[PDB]
From a paper:
[name] helicases, a family of DNA unwinding enzymes that are conserved from bacteria to mammals, play a key role in protecting the genome against deleterious changes (for recent reviews). Mutations in [name] and WRN are associated with the rare genetic diseases Bloom and Werner syndromes, respectively. [name] acts preferentially on recombination and repair intermediates containing HJs to promote efficient branch migration. Novel structural motifs found in the domain, such as the acidic β-wing, the [name]-insertion, and the C-term extended loop, may contribute cooperatively to the specialized functions of [name] in relation to HJ.
Residue numbers in the entry: 1074 to 1194
Write the structure that this text describes.
């Protein structure tokens, strides 16, 4: 139904912005600890105030129900636009963090439009 392309473009650009220290010579990489769980991304997107980061795509999702914002991310993973590997902290917990998938660069080149079906409940 609703076209969610410009949002995916920026969600993608965002995710990758918080992956390296672009600029400084040593293009240092972030994560696994400096990576976002799908919820942290949903919280950031949905302008939540528990958002770890409150810039970039911080206010974007203000027109999405929390339910739908989640499904939009569940989908972006499903579509390999965003992917998630696992992290294991010292307390021996397995945490799933999000990263870009082989299809993200596509959406960035407009070569791929994304569509989303808004759901209730």
């Amino acid at each position: 139904t609703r076209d969610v392309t410009d949002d995916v473009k920026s969600i993608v650009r965002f995710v990758q912005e918080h992956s390296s220290s672009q600029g400084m010579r040593n293009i240092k990489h972030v994560g696994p600890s400096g990576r976002f769980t799908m919820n942290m991304l949903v919280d950031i997107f949905l302008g939540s105030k528990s958002a770890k980061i409150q810039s970039g795509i911080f206010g974007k999702g203000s027109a999405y129900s929390r339910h739908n914002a989640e499904r939009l991310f569940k989908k972006l993973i499903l579509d390999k636009i965003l992917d998630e590997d696992l992290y294991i902290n010292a307390n021996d917990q397995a945490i799933a963090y999000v990263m870009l998938g082989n299809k993200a660069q596509t959406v960035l080149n407009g070569n791929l439009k994304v569509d989303f079906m808004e759901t209730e409940n």
